[PDB]
Design a protein around this motif. Sequence first.
Motif, PDB file in Angstrom:
ATOM      1  N   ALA A 288      -2.106  18.033   5.573  1.00  0.00           N
ATOM      2  CA  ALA A 288      -2.837  16.757   5.613  1.00  0.00           C
ATOM      3  C   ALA A 288      -2.155  15.736   4.726  1.00  0.00           C
ATOM      4  O   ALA A 288      -1.995  14.560   5.101  1.00  0.00           O
ATOM      5  CB  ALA A 288      -4.293  17.016   5.217  1.00  0.00           C
ATOM      6  N   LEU A 289      -1.737  16.119   3.513  1.00  0.00           N
ATOM      7  CA  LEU A 289      -1.134  15.163   2.581  1.00  0.00           C
ATOM      8  C   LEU A 289       0.228  14.683   3.067  1.00  0.00           C
ATOM      9  O   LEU A 289       0.653  13.543   2.761  1.00  0.00           O
ATOM     10  CB  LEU A 289      -0.988  15.774   1.170  1.00  0.00           C
ATOM     11  N   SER A 290       0.925  15.569   3.801  1.00  0.00           N
ATOM     12  CA  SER A 290       2.170  15.106   4.427  1.00  0.00           C
ATOM     13  C   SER A 290       1.888  13.878   5.305  1.00  0.00           C
ATOM     14  O   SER A 290       2.742  13.026   5.520  1.00  0.00           O
ATOM     15  CB  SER A 290       2.810  16.241   5.244  1.00  0.00           C
TER      16      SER A 290
ATOM     17  N   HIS B 118       9.590  26.190  -0.015  1.00  0.00           N
ATOM     18  CA  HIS B 118       9.630  25.221  -1.093  1.00  0.00           C
ATOM     19  C   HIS B 118       8.320  24.431  -1.186  1.00  0.00           C
ATOM     20  O   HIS B 118       7.768  24.252  -2.275  1.00  0.00           O
ATOM     21  CB  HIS B 118      10.823  24.287  -0.839  1.00  0.00           C
ATOM     22  N   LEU B 119       7.812  23.954  -0.058  1.00  0.00           N
ATOM     23  CA  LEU B 119       6.530  23.223  -0.101  1.00  0.00           C
ATOM     24  C   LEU B 119       5.428  24.086  -0.706  1.00  0.00           C
ATOM     25  O   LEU B 119       4.628  23.576  -1.514  1.00  0.00           O
ATOM     26  CB  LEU B 119       6.069  22.746   1.281  1.00  0.00           C
ATOM     27  N   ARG B 120       5.368  25.382  -0.354  1.00  0.00           N
ATOM     28  CA  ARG B 120       4.329  26.230  -0.952  1.00  0.00           C
ATOM     29  C   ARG B 120       4.525  26.486  -2.435  1.00  0.00           C
ATOM     30  O   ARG B 120       3.580  26.635  -3.204  1.00  0.00           O
ATOM     31  CB  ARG B 120       4.276  27.594  -0.218  1.00  0.00           C
TER      32      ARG B 120
ATOM     33  N   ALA C 252       0.796  -1.224   0.000  1.00  0.00           N
ATOM     34  CA  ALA C 252       0.000   0.000   0.000  1.00  0.00           C
ATOM     35  C   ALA C 252       0.838   1.288   0.000  1.00  0.00           C
ATOM     36  O   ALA C 252       0.512   2.226  -0.755  1.00  0.00           O
ATOM     37  CB  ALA C 252      -0.964   0.065   1.168  1.00  0.00           C
ATOM     38  N   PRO C 253       1.869   1.399   0.823  1.00  0.00           N
ATOM     39  CA  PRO C 253       2.620   2.675   0.814  1.00  0.00           C
ATOM     40  C   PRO C 253       3.230   2.936  -0.553  1.00  0.00           C
ATOM     41  O   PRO C 253       3.176   4.042  -1.092  1.00  0.00           O
ATOM     42  CB  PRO C 253       3.714   2.478   1.882  1.00  0.00           C
ATOM     43  N   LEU C 254       3.839   1.930  -1.155  1.00  0.00           N
ATOM     44  CA  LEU C 254       4.409   2.186  -2.490  1.00  0.00           C
ATOM     45  C   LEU C 254       3.368   2.597  -3.504  1.00  0.00           C
ATOM     46  O   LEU C 254       3.637   3.475  -4.328  1.00  0.00           O
ATOM     47  CB  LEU C 254       5.116   0.890  -2.932  1.00  0.00           C
TER      48      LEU C 254
ATOM     49  N   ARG D 134      16.702   4.012  -2.604  1.00  0.00           N
ATOM     50  CA  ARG D 134      15.767   4.779  -3.437  1.00  0.00           C
ATOM     51  C   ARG D 134      16.043   6.258  -3.235  1.00  0.00           C
ATOM     52  O   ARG D 134      16.809   6.847  -3.986  1.00  0.00           O
ATOM     53  CB  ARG D 134      14.308   4.404  -3.123  1.00  0.00           C
ATOM     54  N   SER D 135      15.486   6.913  -2.211  1.00  0.00           N
ATOM     55  CA  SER D 135      15.841   8.311  -1.990  1.00  0.00           C
ATOM     56  C   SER D 135      17.222   8.483  -1.346  1.00  0.00           C
ATOM     57  O   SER D 135      17.929   9.446  -1.649  1.00  0.00           O
ATOM     58  CB  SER D 135      14.762   8.963  -1.108  1.00  0.00           C
ATOM     59  N   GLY D 136      17.558   7.580  -0.429  1.00  0.00           N
ATOM     60  CA  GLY D 136      18.764   7.732   0.375  1.00  0.00           C
ATOM     61  C   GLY D 136      18.378   7.877   1.843  1.00  0.00           C
ATOM     62  O   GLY D 136      19.147   7.445   2.706  1.00  0.00           O
ATOM     63  N   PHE D 137      17.190   8.436   2.101  1.00  0.00           N
ATOM     64  CA  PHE D 137      16.675   8.356   3.488  1.00  0.00           C
ATOM     65  C   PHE D 137      16.296   6.927   3.869  1.00  0.00           C
ATOM     66  O   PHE D 137      16.228   6.050   2.990  1.00  0.00           O
ATOM     67  CB  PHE D 137      15.497   9.335   3.649  1.00  0.00           C
TER      68      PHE D 137
ATOM     69  N   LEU E  38       0.571   4.201  -2.818  1.00  0.00           N
ATOM     70  CA  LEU E  38       0.166   5.584  -2.537  1.00  0.00           C
ATOM     71  C   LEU E  38       1.192   6.534  -3.147  1.00  0.00           C
ATOM     72  O   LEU E  38       0.863   7.537  -3.794  1.00  0.00           O
ATOM     73  CB  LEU E  38       0.017   5.819  -1.030  1.00  0.00           C
ATOM     74  N   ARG E  39       2.466   6.215  -2.948  1.00  0.00           N
ATOM     75  CA  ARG E  39       3.552   6.994  -3.539  1.00  0.00           C
ATOM     76  C   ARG E  39       3.448   7.060  -5.052  1.00  0.00           C
ATOM     77  O   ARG E  39       3.715   8.080  -5.701  1.00  0.00           O
ATOM     78  CB  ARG E  39       4.884   6.348  -3.132  1.00  0.00           C
ATOM     79  N   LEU E  40       3.069   5.952  -5.679  1.00  0.00           N
ATOM     80  CA  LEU E  40       2.967   5.924  -7.147  1.00  0.00           C
ATOM     81  C   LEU E  40       1.855   6.874  -7.590  1.00  0.00           C
ATOM     82  O   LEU E  40       1.983   7.638  -8.541  1.00  0.00           O
ATOM     83  CB  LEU E  40       2.691   4.504  -7.651  1.00  0.00           C
TER      84      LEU E  40
HETATM   85  C1  HEM Z   1       5.456  17.077   1.452  1.00  0.00           C
HETATM   86  C2  HEM Z   1       6.500  16.773   0.602  1.00  0.00           C
HETATM   87  C3  HEM Z   1       7.059  15.377   0.321  1.00  0.00           C
HETATM   88  C4  HEM Z   1       8.340  14.984   0.271  1.00  0.00           C
HETATM   89  C5  HEM Z   1       9.599  15.907   0.248  1.00  0.00           C
HETATM   90  C6  HEM Z   1       8.341  13.501   0.254  1.00  0.00           C
HETATM   91  C7  HEM Z   1       9.508  12.860   0.307  1.00  0.00           C
HETATM   92  C8  HEM Z   1       9.477  11.388   0.310  1.00  0.00           C
HETATM   93  C9  HEM Z   1      10.684  10.564   0.320  1.00  0.00           C
HETATM   94  C10 HEM Z   1      12.126  11.142   0.150  1.00  0.00           C
HETATM   95  C11 HEM Z   1      10.377   9.264   0.502  1.00  0.00           C
HETATM   96  C12 HEM Z   1      11.184   8.014   0.621  1.00  0.00           C
HETATM   97  C13 HEM Z   1      11.269   7.505  -0.824  1.00  0.00           C
HETATM   98  C14 HEM Z   1      12.094   6.154  -0.551  1.00  0.00           C
HETATM   99  O1  HEM Z   1      13.393   6.173  -0.209  1.00  0.00           O
HETATM  100  O2  HEM Z   1      11.630   4.915  -0.703  1.00  0.00           O
HETATM  101  C15 HEM Z   1       8.884   9.261   0.517  1.00  0.00           C
HETATM  102  C16 HEM Z   1       8.139   7.998   0.568  1.00  0.00           C
HETATM  103  C17 HEM Z   1       6.772   8.180   0.778  1.00  0.00           C
HETATM  104  N1  HEM Z   1       5.909   9.180   0.557  1.00  0.00           N
HETATM  105 FE1  HEM Z   1       6.473  11.140   0.505  1.00  0.00          FE
HETATM  106  N2  HEM Z   1       7.044  13.111   0.286  1.00  0.00           N
HETATM  107  C18 HEM Z   1       6.152  14.131   0.322  1.00  0.00           C
HETATM  108  C19 HEM Z   1       4.832  14.089   0.226  1.00  0.00           C
HETATM  109  C20 HEM Z   1       4.109  12.932   0.015  1.00  0.00           C
HETATM  110  C21 HEM Z   1       2.697  12.880  -0.184  1.00  0.00           C
HETATM  111  C22 HEM Z   1       1.973  14.204  -0.552  1.00  0.00           C
HETATM  112  C23 HEM Z   1       2.262  11.623  -0.083  1.00  0.00           C
HETATM  113  C24 HEM Z   1       0.850  10.799  -0.281  1.00  0.00           C
HETATM  114  C25 HEM Z   1      -0.068  11.586   0.165  1.00  0.00           C
HETATM  115  C26 HEM Z   1       3.516  10.825   0.182  1.00  0.00           C
HETATM  116  C27 HEM Z   1       3.420   9.536   0.445  1.00  0.00           C
HETATM  117  C28 HEM Z   1       4.607   8.777   0.662  1.00  0.00           C
HETATM  118  C29 HEM Z   1       4.726   7.314   1.061  1.00  0.00           C
HETATM  119  C30 HEM Z   1       3.422   6.518   1.256  1.00  0.00           C
HETATM  120  C31 HEM Z   1       6.003   6.987   1.191  1.00  0.00           C
HETATM  121  C32 HEM Z   1       6.516   5.622   1.533  1.00  0.00           C
HETATM  122  C33 HEM Z   1       6.754   4.704   0.319  1.00  0.00           C
HETATM  123  C34 HEM Z   1       7.185   3.268   0.690  1.00  0.00           C
HETATM  124  O3  HEM Z   1       6.979   2.749   1.743  1.00  0.00           O
HETATM  125  O4  HEM Z   1       7.786   2.649  -0.236  1.00  0.00           O
HETATM  126  N3  HEM Z   1       4.583  11.677   0.246  1.00  0.00           N
HETATM  127  N4  HEM Z   1       8.402  10.543   0.397  1.00  0.00           N
END
Ligand code: HEM
Length: 249
Positions: A157-159, A139-141, A32-34, A171-174, A36-38
């Motif tokens: 909320a989306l954060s 930057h976010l704005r 699910a998390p991946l 992937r990202s490095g985090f 959502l990210r997609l």
């Molecule tokens: C607010 C600014 C955002 C930044 C800078 C950001 C940054 C990131 C980064 C760097 C990762 C890790 C990618 C990885 O190494 O696998 C990540 C994963 C994630 N992001 Fe964000 N993100 C943001 C907003 C969002 C939004 C708006 C959503 C969905 C509403 C989202 C949902 C997710 C999820 C679900 C993961 C985890 C993916 C996994 O488990 O594989 N992010 N994000």
Amino acid sequence: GKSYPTVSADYQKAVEKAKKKLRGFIAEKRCAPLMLRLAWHSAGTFDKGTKTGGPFGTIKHPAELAHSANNGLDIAVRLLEPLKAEFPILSYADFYQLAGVVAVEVTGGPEVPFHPGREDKPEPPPEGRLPDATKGSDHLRDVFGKAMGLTDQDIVALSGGHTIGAAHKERSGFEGPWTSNPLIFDNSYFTELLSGEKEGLLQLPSDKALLSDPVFRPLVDKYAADEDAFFADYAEAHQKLSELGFADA
Ligand code: HEM
Ligand SMILES: [K+]
């Protein structure tokens, strides 16, 4: 200002069928998390002034998957291809946004309204529109507000989408999850953000920016205190995100 297009009864039947198969697939694969990210990286490229990018199926294109922001999302695309093939009438555009809606639902999150009709477009947007995890509130704005057209409330909320899932150093490095229960959609993202850094849990500089911004911080507080409030604002924001440039902008 949304006027959703008409789709045929067979299209709507496929939406409903696909929605059920996506639940079972995403729950079984624990992805699910991946997913959502997609969906979010599909939508998050929308630029309101040019009306380019947005949730129009382009993320399956190798050129867009190659964006470094999208590292790892080729896995997502590949995981979905067999199921997508059972629903040839659906656009990829709709299929990926449906997957995002279902990802939130099957982890216990709110039911985000879904409207079909997105067309698959030919050109992916240029690279560089998705947010940089190392930057802050301005930057976010720029990205959510000036490009996509979402509100400050939508940004916080989306954060909270980071309440599921984890970063990966390849992937990202985090690296690591934001929460102790990263397959459970709840307000824990905000409660961890308030409490300090706990060992093993992740906070990006972009997450921390929410605590020091005068508009964002009261939203963080509300959401940490009231999950129902979080869910309501989350659902509004995810729907808006998933519909950028669609059925009017
Ligand atoms: C607010 C600014 C955002 C930044 C800078 C950001 C940054 C990131 C980064 C760097 C990762 C890790 C990618 C990885 O190494 O696998 C990540 C994963 C994630 N992001 Fe964000 N993100 C943001 C907003 C969002 C939004 C708006 C959503 C969905 C509403 C989202 C949902 C997710 C999820 C679900 C993961 C985890 C993916 C996994 O488990 O594989 N992010 N994000
Ligand atoms: K969680």
